[PDB]
């Protein structure tokens, strides 16, 4: 029932931008926050950017700054991340996370997503 299925997984050339659509199902998208965690092949989970409940709060990871726009359309039910320039290093499988963590009610990264095998190639 609860799920955060993802799409937009494809090989992209460096310096080219692909919107990644993280769809949502069986959840009230507005209250739940969403953020993006990426695992480079043969490495460990890393963190990128966060969008709040209102869609008014955006904070970004230091490693990539101003290189991605994270936007939550509640009516679409889809959080969209697009990276203006993709480095060869970022060949990770991007993961979408649902975090209810400021409401006297919830805990972090509760469900997670199947993931999209993004790829950088040359």
């Amino acid at each position: 029932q609860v799920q955060l299925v993802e799409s937009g997984g494809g090989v992209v050339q460096p310096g080219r931008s692909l919107r990644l659509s993280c769809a949502s199902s069986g959840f009230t998208f507005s209250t739940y926050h969403m953020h993006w965690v990426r695992q480079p092949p043969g490495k460990g989970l890393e963190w990128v950017a966060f969008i709040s409940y209102d869609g008014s709060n955006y904070y970004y990871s230091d490693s990539v700054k101003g290189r991605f726009t994270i936007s939550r359309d509640n009516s679409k039910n889809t959080v969209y991340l697009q990276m203006n320039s993709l480095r060869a290093e970022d060949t990770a499988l991007y993961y979408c996370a649902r975090d209810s963590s400021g409401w006297h009610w919830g805990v972090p990264f509760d469900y997670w997503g199947q993931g999209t095998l993004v790829t950088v190639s040359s």
Binding site: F50, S52, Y53, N57, D99, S101, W103, H104
Partner: peptide, 13 residues
């Protein structure tokens, strides 16, 4: 008295 953190919901960049 009840209290809970709120860095995301209340604070802004």
């Amino acid at each position: 008295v009840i209290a809970w953190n709120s860095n995301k919901l209340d604070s802004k960049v």
